[PDB]
Design a protein around this ligand. Structure first.
Ligand SMILES: Nc1ncnc2c1ncn2[C@@H]1O[C@H](COP(=O)(O)OP(=O)(O)OC[C@H]2O[C@@H](O)[C@H](O)[C@@H]2O)[C@@H](O)[C@H]1O
Ligand SMILES: Nc1ncnc2c1ncn2[C@@H]1O[C@H](COP(=O)(O)OP(=O)(O)OC[C@H]2O[C@@H](O)[C@H](O)[C@@H]2O)[C@@H](O)[C@H]1O
Lengths: 179, 175
């Protein structure tokens, strides 16, 4: 398990340059060509907008043709492998019609379930916190925006609040989980 | 050099898998009752918990208006690299010639802040939602990282703040 930090110190799962410029083409972070030219423009604080071949890069929004961009710093960090009980598992919920929380992938009060689950959403959120994601539940289509922490029915436009919280682990749970 | 990641995977500078802290400049302070805080946090219905007459708001991640964070315990150790591969971040403000002056360098009026890029990057790394006071010439300013603005406390004139790296060429890397 090896990470680099992006331009906002975000952990991202060395390279010949001290920097690596990428854009998110769902589901993969792709290397820009002309990384040194991008960096040189970026290091001029007067520059917001540049063109790199087919691409309009916007440093103020950190987007390129509406896709998120990032700058990885090269200094790598290697995880010290510990018992998995010390790793946080994140659950994802949406506010249902009974004004309660259903976990993604579990049954709504109307006997409907998303195909996406907490593991699917945490993996996408970790990779791409400014992501928007399409998903199915029952007979309906939805967009989830990590930035707004909302899901929207693409047909009706009804929004529901999204919440992300951990699986609870007590100090007792920690002792048991040391075999 | 060892880091761990917060609740939003941010790199930060334990017997539980979690460590709950609030930021009172200049220090991240440990909450007492970390396990009780975590138990409330793992209930997605809970936004407000009060402990010791201190009001935690999980929606804003504040406590009595100070930022809070939840550190994950798994540590990550820096791979030894030449320092030419380390990014240095410069901080600038929009001056009266609507050009950029680096913090700590002379304005068009021959005035300079005491604070510099190293001071601001260090504070920004620790506390991205930080608001801070600083002096330049004979005037006092507030700098909000979130707004990326400095405001003269007296006149209320705002100036835009920008953070960009020192440029390092592939040639610089070879030399
Ligand atoms: N992530 C989800 N997982 C499972 N079920 C979900 C999810 N989000 C919404 N639902 C279910 O979808 C139903 C409809 O809610 P939304 O799609 O959020 O929005 P709304 O516009 O109110 O309803 C659309 C509804 O109109 C009906 O004509 C049609 O059959 C459709 O279900 C609710 O019962 C809810 O349980
Ligand atoms: N971070 C800074 N570092 C150095 N100099 C600065 C900084 N911020 C502003 N200055 C300089 O301070 C001068 C005044 O700008 P501000 O304090 O931002 O705003 P303004 O409201 O115009 O000034 C209020 C008062 O300040 C005094 O200089 C003067 O008496 C004026 O009435 C300008 O020359 C500006 O370049």
């Amino acid at each position: 398990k090896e990470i680099c930090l992006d331009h906002l110190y975000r952990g991202c799962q060395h390279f010949h340059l001290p920097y690596r410029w990428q854009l998110f083409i769902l589901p993969t972070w792709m290397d820009f060509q002309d990384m040194e030219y991008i960096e040189r423009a970026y290091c001029d604080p007067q520059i917001e907008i540049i063109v790199i071949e087919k691409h309009r890069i916007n440093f103020k929004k950190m987007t390129c043709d509406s896709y998120p961009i990032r700058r990885l710093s090269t200094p790598s960090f290697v995880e010290k492998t510990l018992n998995s009980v010390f790793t946080t598992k994140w659950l994802w919920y949406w506010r249902n019609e009974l004004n309660e929380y259903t976990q993604y992938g579990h049954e709504s009060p109307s006997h409907t379930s998303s195909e996406i689950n907490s593991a699917y959403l945490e993996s996408f959120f970790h990779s791409c916190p400014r992501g928007v994601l399409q998903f199915h539940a029952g007979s309906q289509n939805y967009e989830l925006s990590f930035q707004g922490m909302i899901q929207t029915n693409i047909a009706s436009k009804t929004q529901r609040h999204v919440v992300r919280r951990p699986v609870f682990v007590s100090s007792k749970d920690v002792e048991q989980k040391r075999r």
